[PDB]
Amino acid sequence: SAEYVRALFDFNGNDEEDLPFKKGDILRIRDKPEEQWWNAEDSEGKRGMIPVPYVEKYH
């Protein structure tokens, strides 16, 4: 019962802690320290922060 999101826009990543991704990517949600910034993990296991408005709740 993992929580995923689908990237709506390409995010190159602004900060070193940010998780860069591309439009259509599936990311697993690990943490929610903020309303608009969540800690996610991509398909390859790389972790980092992502902007919520750039993704949609998968399923």
């Binding site: 826009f9 995010f11 602004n14 608009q36 910034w37 408005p53 750039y54």
Partner: peptide, 10 residues
Amino acid sequence: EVPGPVPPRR
């Protein structure tokens, strides 16, 4: 900038 700006951090 096709997407809107990223949200404010903290």
